[model samples]
Target chain A: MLMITSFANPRVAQAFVDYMATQGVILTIQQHNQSDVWLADESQAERVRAELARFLENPADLE
Target chain B: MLMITSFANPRVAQAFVDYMATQGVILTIQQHNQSDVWLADESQAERVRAELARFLENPADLE
Candidate 1:
């Protein structure tokens, strides 16, 4: 797995994780100084990066 | 001041703070159980909440 990004808020990170699930992407959050989002599928990296960009641009959109 | 949210990663929370600074929003991050994003201006609560939501969804956007 690769570390895609990190979040200060676990809840927010979890929200992203939950959102990815709906999109058929699996993500996990773990603590290593902060909540880190991990990706097990390398093939999904690009998509995950793009979605992450969108999510950071506006996380409320997921709501 | 109000805690808009908390992040497991202090760096990510700081990135959001830095981004908010560019937008003329003064945000601060402190540690408690994790990194906490604080807003001193009560009027900016809504905006902070929204931005925090965005930050939490994807911290890489600040990059």
Candidate 2:
């Protein structure tokens, strides 16, 4: 399991998961203190990171 | 439209909408500045606010 990133709000974390799902990447969320850590299969980690960047840069596309 | 709240991340805004949908609230997103404002039916504003509180207090529940 490779940690991709963390979100302070679970709603945000789950949102990214749902968005990624549309692209065929299934990620998992784990609670870490006050934030949520996201993990992806090592095989898909690279793709997840790339998609994550795209999402963060212009999340309005998902709006 | 009554604004329920705003989110810096569209993914999180969409996540809140999806979760609220499960409870029967369909929300709309509007971009304002760098945040996304979530709106609900005037009739459902109160209900939406309550649910929003629950979601924020323990967003992890959505995880």
Candidate 3:
């Protein structure tokens, strides 16, 4: 329900995903062609996505 | 197992990925180009493959 998206950066993606996982998010890692995106759903998707987006990538891209 | 793939919209990808994760679905989020895929092992890969097929870009673009 919450959304936090980023570009294709495997390292960044992994870091974000790992953080979510540690928080008991059970994040997943899937590849498209080059980059990666960490997905987590805990209702707090807003905060989780916000935190990752704020530090990892550009949030404006969301807009 | 379920495979939920999507176009490279980090936030949307994150949302869908999160849904699976909360369901106790262990997902792997990986990127390739302008898209991201969410994979889950819960005998719902087919359904996932289908849900993702919509809204997203063209898969034949992949084919």
Candidate 4:
């Protein structure tokens, strides 16, 4: 599967990648400046999400 | 210092990335479809070059 998760906000994108790196969800990702990315998964998507919360100050942070 | 090494060959870029992965020369790289790449360095240039040689395969390997 291909996931091109885009974050119009740089803080959000950085937080996402930082969290993903924490978990065992190793990825081959491409960052387009401070906002866009081409990220992929090889199983372990759940753990990656949990770690991502730390990057967001609130669930609304991404909203 | 910055570099924008380009190639007229597809296999060359693939090989370069593959080899770069082997050394501890991790990069924030962007491959433009099999022809160009945006590779940045952080004091890991030497390791990156050695790994790239395997990808070039001599001469047009980059000339």
Candidate-wise lDDT, in order: 0.51, 0.48, 0.45, 0.35
**Model 2: pairs clashing at backbone N, Cα or C within 3 Å:** none
lDDT of 3 by residue, B1-63 (tens): 222333455565555456546755444566555323343434444444444344135433222
Candidate with more favorable, higher lDDT: 3 or 4: 3
* Model 1 segments more than 4 A misplaced: A1-63, B33-63
lDDT of 2 by residue, B1-63 (tens): 344444555566566556444544555555332112233234444444454456557645445
Segments in model 3 whose C-alpha atoms lie over 4 Å from true places: A1-4, A34-63, B1-63
Every candidate's DockQ is 0.05, 0.04, 0.10, 0.03
TM-score of each: 0.28, 0.26, 0.26, 0.22
Output the lDDT of residue A58, model 4: 47
Rate residue A49 of model 1 by lDDT: 49
Tens-digit lDDT track for model 2 on A1-63? Answer: 434444555566666555444544555666442112233244444444455455446745445
Candidate 3 local Cα displacement, residue B12, angstroms: 31
Scored by TM against the true chain B, the candidates give 0.46, 0.45, 0.37, 0.34
Ranking by lDDT: 1, 2, 3, 4
Candidate that would win on DockQ: 3
Residue range B1-63, candidate 1, lDDT tens digits: 434444576566666555544654555665443323333445544554555466556656332
Give a tens-digit lDDT track for model 3, residues A1-63: 222343365654465455444544444555555224433444544554555445345444332
Better of 2 and 3 by DockQ: 3
Candidate 1 has an interface RMSD (Å) of 21.0
Model 2: interface root-mean-square deviation in Å: 20.9
